[PDB]
Design a binder for this molecule. Structure first.
Ligand SMILES: Cc1cc2nc3c(=O)[nH]c(=O)nc-3n(C[C@H](O)[C@H](O)[C@H](O)COP(=O)(O)O)c2cc1C
Ligand code: SF4
Ligand code: SF4
Ligand code: SF4
Ligand code: SF4
Ligand code: FES
Ligand code: FES
Lengths: 230, 430, 212, 54, 59, 41, 66
């Protein structure tokens, strides 16, 4: 009656039909590391981080957008799964600038945490390191577009929640500038909610910009005002 | 079994290579089109699929997926969503002119084949995607569509029977990625050309959400000839996995660089010299041979003097066979420079979905620049080997893979010229 | 290559831009080909009509295409910044594409590059201090089987040499245009030896077939 | 030091031109590297005697 | 390599070398560093208050 | 036949693709709709 | 008033006690005497999304960008 058998490294569990490998892996506790997938949006696949060696397959496949046939076994802690994670994490940090002091996501990065816990240590790629000059999106949202890892999360957020359709990919190859083409100061509702979407330090708060770095500040429960929803 | 195979006349699948007797549906009827096709259509598409798998058609365009398995996936029972046939006609793998010849001298057999493919799987409309480089040949295709419509035999209620089938033509805008399997589909959709993810197949969700498929022009051309001719007459030319005729063309360094139909297997020295002039400077002048085009590793001299031209043979040679640029190159050119220009081409045309092809072609372009100038260490050439092991298959499409393979072939074969180049740079700086 | 607009008028909407009602009938044929429910698929043919009407597309052309196809303009800006046939910089009458990658460069395109350079004067990638000579070198086009090639506005030139460079450029100065086909004889893509192709007039439907 | 940059911080040259080494420098000095759970004991010979640490 | 005075440096004919990136207060094992940061009218990120407690400084 | 049977391509003007698409618009079955007229209606 | 710091007369201000179950939390809080406010655990809600549904035909779930 609508169940699917998978083995997470031997531990059997049941999967509803149509869902992903990733929701079942998060059901058993294993957080497969992700960059483009986010549960409030649709499923892109453009970050490639969620590769996992699924058995009897020479090719290692994504986990955010895989249909779940009956009777899997999912090897998360294998050899070439770790090798693919090392490779992808080495690819991300190539054209990313040395801005971790002047970033605003020092305590709250994603490249930093996942490159400690999953990446390599000795870097490579001696020369190169192109840079994309920033834009002026809005006076409420400070924007540096060199740190953009082109992950296509703000674009999906715009076209699927905001409905404004002002952010887009421009170019090919390495050169993909993400933003608005026409020098237009992007101003709409929920434009303050894009600084929490952007997983790397490429879209930060403008009025907050350089007052603290989030290990000093303590976090406290409270209830919203000014809206009747809270 | 043939002794390695060669061309026997009138066993050509299509005649009228260039400029022959006319260019007309009447000339198509004289060459063998619109002949007894309704009795083939009204027998049942299962018999057409049996005829094609009797011929055993290996899929073209340098992929390897056979047509019979694909169009047997296309036998889904018809729901409320229609079925579409997309005829891809770009020419990547620079060196090609594969179907430029076909769409310039014979669109009528393509019309025959798209009608056959539309009947053989429940398809309803066929979009034919031409490269944007081909305005004049596209207008020749439009004239041929006008002639086939003006005959009153395709469009609505084809072959006299109650079976409508419409064909449209969409131009390209200039890309390598629009030739691929699914970026084609979304380039038709008006969104910018970007491939989808594979485990949702095009035969389940395709052009906006319909079970469609994509055929190469050589498959469309060979398809009505197998229907109108006997079973496995096509299959008697070559081996058992791959079977039939293929365009082996030298677009490159020979005297009179040109195009020939041949069978599936051929001795390579007869192929190069006894059909297309001669090698520039003789057989011993060339440094190496690339088959396939640009998504294929190289083949050196001591391997190219003996290896026959089969798909299984080039699997045994760790390469992949494609079309029309089965060419040699001279010692007088530097293969490092040639492959570096090819990597520059790969950077200039690639979409930016996947991180690894993007950054890998970035590193390989800058590192092949530092190799042409020779400003590196041997750990760098083995690092280029390591990254070419890392990239391959970790993407969506095969452009990253086809950027991995030439680096692989260059490292597997032509180490000593790299070492001498770097030693001469050391002598230059010191 | 500066993928952000940065108006610089002779751009800066509204630049006055409008078509011909005959071209409007072309537009209705184009969005009558594609099925109802997915009107947004004809963006590239309508923008191709805009380029063929006015040789390079301004931003007001993109606003016009967006209002005709009733889409937000951002998809039109994506398709304009994505492909190759659409040059957002203003160009001249004739447009030179010197194609050189794998058979073309390896069959000595650099002689043709030198010939174009020291005949025209302006450097590669740039434009000219007049019209009709916007020169760019380009990647592969498909037509590979001959000498490295030149594309001008919907026409080809193969089997080149610097005297043919002088002839074709002086005749585009004069205005008389040569053929799209090959040169040095061999009137198509030909095996240019002793005619190793078919010679007999082919039979076709007459001889032995089966189940037909 | 060890050649395991996720435990010992790198040096200045790679620190001023890397990316992974700058990230490792930053988070290694802010958070401190994670240490797997468990209880260990060891003891060496201080000049007094058994200097033990648990 | 003696450790004494707790002095600051600056750029060659340039501005203050500090960015206020809070690493020294994140590592300061008696928390004697106190950094409150603001950007100025230019745009480069800088400080307001950079205090060393000489009592707590273990050096 | 060793004579170039083309040059039928040679007269192609820069409008002819849209001209042929224009003139061949008849016998067009209705390109089947789906609910709304557009993704945003 | 001399350096611009945040002093406090609160020794208990920087306590935290990370536990594993709500039952032992409430038991320890009632064992050690003071009052307590229990907020309940909220998991992320499981959803139903698919890439083919992002490529719909006559359903409005359409990606509209890629
Ligand atoms: C890297 C790559 C490049 C391709 N380039 C072209 C091309 O230029 N033209 C084309 O018609 N198909 C091209 N294709 C598609 C293949 O020809 C593919 O085999 C085709 O969709 C179906 O061919 P088959 O069914 O005969 O195997 C390309 C595919 C890939 C992966
Ligand atoms: S701006 Fe941020 S969210 Fe948007 S694509 Fe770039 S990294 Fe992703
Ligand atoms: S987003 Fe980039 S610059 Fe910012 S902390 Fe992370 S890696 Fe450093
Ligand atoms: S490998 Fe590169 S060119 Fe191919 S789909 Fe991925 S990003 Fe695009
Ligand atoms: S905040 Fe501290 S660590 Fe950072 S630049 Fe200033 S003095 Fe150096
Ligand atoms: S999470 Fe699956 S690829 Fe981004
Ligand atoms: S490389 Fe010049 S045409 Fe293909």
């Amino acid at each position: 009656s609508n169940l699917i058998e998978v083995f997470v490294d031997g531990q059997s569990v049941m999967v509803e039909p149509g869902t992903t490998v990733l929701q079942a892996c998060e059901k058993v506790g294993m957080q497969i590391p992700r960059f483009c997938y986010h549960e409030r949006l649709s499923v892109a696949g453009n970050c490639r981080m969620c590769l996992v060696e699924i058995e009897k397959a020479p090719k290692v496949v994504a986990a955010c957008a895989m249909p779940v046939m009956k009777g899997w076994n999912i090897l998360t802690n294998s050899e070439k799964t770790k090798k693919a994670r090392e490779g992808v994490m080495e690819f991300l940090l190539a054209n990313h600038p040395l801005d971790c002091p002047i970033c605003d996501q020092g305590g709250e990065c994603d490249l930093q945490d996942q490159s400690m816990m999953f990446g390599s240590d000795r870097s490579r790629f001696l020369e190169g390191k192109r840079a994309v000059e920033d834009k002026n999106i809005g006076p409420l949202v400070k924007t540096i577009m060199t740190r953009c890892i082109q992950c296509t999360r703000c674009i999906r957020f715009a076209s699927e929640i905001a409905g404004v359709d002002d952010l887009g990919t421009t170019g090919r190859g390495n050169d993909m500038q993400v933003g608005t083409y026409i020098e237009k100061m992007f101003m709409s509702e929920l434009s303050g909610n894009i600084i929490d979407i952007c997983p790397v330090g490429a879209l930060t708060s403008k009025p907050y910009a350089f007052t603290a770095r989030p290990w000093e500040t303590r976090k406290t429960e409270s209830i919203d005002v000014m809206d009747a929803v809270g | 079994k043939t002794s390695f195979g060669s061309l026997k006349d009138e066993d050509r699948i299509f005649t009228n290579l260039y400029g022959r007797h006319d260019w007309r549906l009447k000339g198509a009827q004289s060459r063998g089109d619109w002949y007894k096709t309704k009795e083939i259509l009204l027998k049942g598409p299962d018999w057409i699929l049996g005829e094609v798998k009797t011929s055993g058609l290996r899929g073209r365009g340098g992929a390897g997926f056979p047509t019979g398995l694909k169009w047997s996936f296309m036998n889904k029972p018809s729901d409320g969503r229609p079925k579409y046939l997309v005829v891809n006609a770009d020419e990547g793998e620079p060196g090609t002119c594969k179907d430029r010849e076909i769409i310039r001298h014979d669109p009528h057999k393509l019309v025959e084949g798209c009608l056959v493919g539309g009947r053989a799987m429940g398809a309803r409309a066929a979009y034919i995607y031409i490269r944007g480089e081909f305005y004049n040949e596209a207008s020749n295709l439009q004239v041929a569509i006008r002639e086939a419509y003006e005959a009153g035999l395709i469009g609505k209620n084809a072959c006299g029977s109650g079976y409508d089938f419409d064909v449209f033509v969409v131009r390209g805008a200039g890309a390598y990625i629009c030739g691929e399997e699914t970026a084609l589909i979304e380039s038709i959709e008006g969104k910018q050309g970007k491939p989808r993810l594979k485990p949702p197949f095009p035969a389940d969700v395709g052009v906006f959400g319909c079970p469609t498929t994509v055929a190469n022009v050589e498959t469309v051309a060979v398809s009505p000839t197998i229907c109108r001719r006997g079973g496995a007459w096509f299959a008697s030319f070559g081996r058992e996995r791959n079977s039939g005729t293929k365009l082996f063309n030298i677009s490159g360094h020979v005297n009179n660089p040109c195009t020939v139909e041949e069978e599936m297997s051929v001795p390579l020295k007869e192929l190069i010299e006894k059909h297309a002039g001669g090698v520039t400077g003789g057989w011993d002048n060339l440094l190496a041979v690339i088959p396939g085009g640009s998504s294929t590793p190289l083949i050196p001299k001591s391997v190219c003097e003996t290896v026959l031209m089969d798909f299984d043979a080039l699997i045994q040679a760790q390469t992949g066979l494609g079309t029309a640029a089965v060419i040699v190159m001279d010692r007088s050119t530097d293969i490092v420079k040639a492959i570096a220009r090819l990597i520059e081409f790969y950077k200039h045309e690639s979409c930016g979905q996947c991180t690894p092809c993007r950054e890998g072609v970035d590193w390989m372009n800058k590192v092949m620049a530092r190799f042409v100038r020779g400003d590196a260490r041997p750990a760098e050439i083995d690092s280029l080997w390591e990254i070419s092991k890392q990239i391959e298959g970790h993407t969506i499409c095969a452009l990253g893979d086809g950027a991995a393979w030439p680096v692989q072939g260059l490292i597997r074969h032509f180490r000593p010229e790299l070492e001498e180049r770097m030693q001469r740079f050391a002598q230059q700086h010191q | 290559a500066l993928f952000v607009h940065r108006d610089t008028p002779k751009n800066n909407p509204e630049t006055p831009f409008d078509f011909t009602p005959e071209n409007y009938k072309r537009i209705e044929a184009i969005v009558k080909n594609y099925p109802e429910g997915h009107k947004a698929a004809a963006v590239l043919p309508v923008l191709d009509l805009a380029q063929r009407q006015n040789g390079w597309l301004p931003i007001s052309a993109m606003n016009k295409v967006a209002e005709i196809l009733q889409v937000p303009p951002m998809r039109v800006y994506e398709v304009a910044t994505f492909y190759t046939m659409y040059n957002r910089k203003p160009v001249g009458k004739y447009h030179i594409q010197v194609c050189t990658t794998t058979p073309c460069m390896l069959r000595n395109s650099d002689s043709i590059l030198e010939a174009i350079q020291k005949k025209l004067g302006i450097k590669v990638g740039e434009t000219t201090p007049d019209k009709l000579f916007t020169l760019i070198e380009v990647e592969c086009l498909g037509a590979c089987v001959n000498a490295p090639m030149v594309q001008i506005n919907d026409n080809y030139y193969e089997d080149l040499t610097p005297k043919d460079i002088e002839e074709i450029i002086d005749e585009l100065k004069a205005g008389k245009i040569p053929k799209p086909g090959p040169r040095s004889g061999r009137f198509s893509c030909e095996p240019a030896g002793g005619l190793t192709s078919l010679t007999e007039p082919p039979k076709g439907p007459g001889f032995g077939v089966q189940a037909g | 030091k060890v050649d395991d940059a996720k435990v010992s911080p790198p040096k200045r040259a790679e620190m001023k031109t890397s990316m992974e080494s700058l990230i490792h420098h930053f988070k290694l000095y802010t958070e401190g590297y994670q240490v797997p759970p468990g209880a260990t004991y060891t003891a060496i010979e201080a000049p007094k005697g058994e200097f033990g640490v648990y | 390599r003696f450790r004494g005075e707790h002095a600051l440096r600056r750029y060659p004919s340039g501005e203050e070398r500090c960015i206020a990136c809070k690493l020294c207060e994140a590592v300061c094992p008696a928390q004697a560093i106190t950094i409150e940061a603001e950007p100025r009218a230019d745009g480069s990120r800088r400080t307001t208050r950079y205090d060393i407690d000489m009592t707590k400084c273990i050096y | 036949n060793t004579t170039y049977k083309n040059l039928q391509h040679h007269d192609y003007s820069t409008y002819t693709f849209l001209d042929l698409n224009l003139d061949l618009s008849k016998f067009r079955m209705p390109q089947p709709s789906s609910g709304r007229e557009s993704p945003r209606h | 008033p001399l350096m611009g710091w945040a002093s406090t007369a609160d020794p208990l201000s920087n306590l935290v006690l990370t536990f594993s179950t709500k039952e032992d939390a409430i038991a320890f809080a009632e064992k050690n005497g003071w009052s307590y406010d229990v907020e309940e655990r909220k998991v992320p809600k499981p959803k139903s999304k698919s890439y083919g549904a992002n490529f719909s035909w006559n359903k409005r779930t359409r990606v509209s960008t890629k």
